[PDB]
Amino acid sequence: EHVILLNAQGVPTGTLEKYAAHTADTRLHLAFSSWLFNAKGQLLVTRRALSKKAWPGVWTNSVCGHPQLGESNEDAVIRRCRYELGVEITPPESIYPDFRFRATDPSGIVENEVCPVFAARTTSALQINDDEVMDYQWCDLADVLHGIDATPWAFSPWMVMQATNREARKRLSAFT
Amino acid sequence: EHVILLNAQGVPTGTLEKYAAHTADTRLHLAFSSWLFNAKGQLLVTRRALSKKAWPGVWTNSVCGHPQLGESNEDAVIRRCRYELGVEITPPESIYPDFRFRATDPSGIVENEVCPVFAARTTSALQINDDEVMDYQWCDLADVLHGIDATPWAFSPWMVMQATNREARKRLSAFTQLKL
Numbered sequence: 389e390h391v392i393l394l395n396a397q398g399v400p401t402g403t404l405e406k407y408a409a410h411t412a413d414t415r416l417h418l419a420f421s422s423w424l425f426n427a428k429g430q431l432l433v434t435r436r437a438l439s440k441k442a443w444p445g446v447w448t449n450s451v452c453g454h455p456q457l458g459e460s461n462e463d464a465v466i467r468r469c470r471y472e473l474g475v476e477i478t479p480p481e482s483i484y485p486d487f488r489f490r491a492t493d494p495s496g497i498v499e500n501e502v503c504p505v506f507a508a509r510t511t512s513a514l515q516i517n518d519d520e521v522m523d524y525q526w527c528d529l530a531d532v533l534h535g536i537d538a539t540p541w542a543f544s545p546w547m548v549m550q551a552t553n554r555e556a557r558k559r560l561s562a563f564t
Numbered sequence: 565e566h567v568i569l570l571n572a573q574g575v576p577t578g579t580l581e582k583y584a585a586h587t588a589d590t591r592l593h594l595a596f597s598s599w600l601f602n603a604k605g606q607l608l609v610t611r612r613a614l615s616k617k618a619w620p621g622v623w624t625n626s627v628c629g630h631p632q633l634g635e636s637n638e639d640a641v642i643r644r645c646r647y648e649l650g651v652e653i654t655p656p657e658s659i660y661p662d663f664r665f666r667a668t669d670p671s672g673i674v675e676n677e678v679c680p681v682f683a684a685r686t687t688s689a690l691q692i693n694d695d696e697v698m699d700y701q702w703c704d705l706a707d708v709l710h711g712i713d714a715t716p717w718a719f720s721p722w723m724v725m726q727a728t729n730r731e732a733r734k735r736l737s738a739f740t741q742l743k744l
């Protein structure tokens with residue numbers, strides 16, 4: 389498994405092993421972020437396993453990942469939903485297509501990503517992969533947004549950035 | 565290091581090495597929890613280190629610990645503030661002396677404690693201890709209380725429980741006053 393390095397423009401220029409790619413000096417690459425809601429309109433929020441290299445133990449939006457060469461964003465989402473959460477989903481829909489960010493985690497591990505954001509509805513029950521998720525909570529978007537507005541530090545930095553993007557917030561608010 | 569074992573009532577019966585005491589079947593023991601405010605009245609929120617046996621990587625209030633043999637709870641508070649956060653404090657105030665809590669953490673570790681709660685002001689800069697604390701933030705109490713209300717599952721259960729105790733909460737609020 390790998391990540392896709394991107395030049396100043398979003399042009400793929402090569403790849404790196406996924407583990408070896410996230411360091412104190414992580415280089416720009418391709419990723420995705422996805423927010424999942426069940427049939428009742430609840431948002432799935434997850435807590436990253438303690439073994440994740442970047443932001444271990446941190447509360448975040450439902451599923452995040454790294455598309456592989458030749459893979460569409462939507463397929464990557466479906467893939468990681470299955471892999472991390474054993475869940476089937478409806479076709480992922482665009483909510484923040486130009487999201488990009490760089491941040492540093494408490495141990496100094498950096499993420500540096502072009503990271504289009506999506507949303508989808510689950511169509512099956514979760515089956516948790518504890519190598520990836522250590523905890524999770526089905527909740528009302530509205531409460532999650534309040535939490536994010538009041539104590540952003542309690543959540544991953546990119547979760548906060550996405551939720552406080554005016555357009556992306558409107559679009560998520562329509563999934564409930 | 566040890567914990568002080570308490571019987572079915574909060575009466576001490578002996579001691580037990582710290583690590584070995586905290587398992588999936590933790591016996592009742594003495595502990596403390598403290599809420600620290602800077603001069604400006606901001607609350608110090610901290611994140612437990614990933615190496616903590618119980619609730620690693622979790623956001624919680626300022627500092628918690630285990631008094632040792634012959635130690636006042638207040639002394640214990642002063643000591644862990646120094647050890648965990650390197651910080652000097654004013655005399656800790658008792659804000660919830662009867663707090664008691666039992667709970668299992670995300671991997672099955674149990675805390676079962678008599679845990680009086682205190683509040684105090686910091687009087688020095690921080691020197692965070694990375695083997696204890698992996699991250700922190702200085703916050704306005706109102707915000708913290710609003711996040712706890714909106715998403716309580718994102719913080720330690722004992723922070724939520726203490727924060728929603730009416731008397732405790734009013735003490736916390738009193739410490740938000742700016743003090744030179």
Ligand SMILES: C[C@@H](CO)CCOP(=O)(O)OP(=O)(O)O
Pocket residue numbers: 595596597618628629630644675677679722
């Ligand atoms: C209320 C309990 C835990 O919730 C107090 C325990 O404090 P800890 O920090 O977990 O213990 P210690 O500081 O002694 O390692």
Ligand SMILES: C[C@H](CO)CCOP(=O)(O)OP(=O)(O)O
Pocket residue numbers: 406419420421442451452453454468499501503546
């Ligand atoms: C974190 C960037 C954007 O948020 C995407 C990567 O999310 P990860 O969960 O770290 O991806 P992976 O599951 O492949 O480890």
Ligand SMILES: [Mg+2]
Pocket residue numbers: 451452453468472
């Ligand atoms: Mg992921």
Ligand SMILES: [Mg+2]
Pocket residue numbers: 627628629644648
């Ligand atoms: Mg402690």
Ligand SMILES: [Mn+2]
Pocket residue numbers: 391410417419454499500501
């Ligand atoms: Mn990445």
Ligand SMILES: [Mn+2]
Pocket residue numbers: 567586593595630675676677
């Ligand atoms: Mn204990």
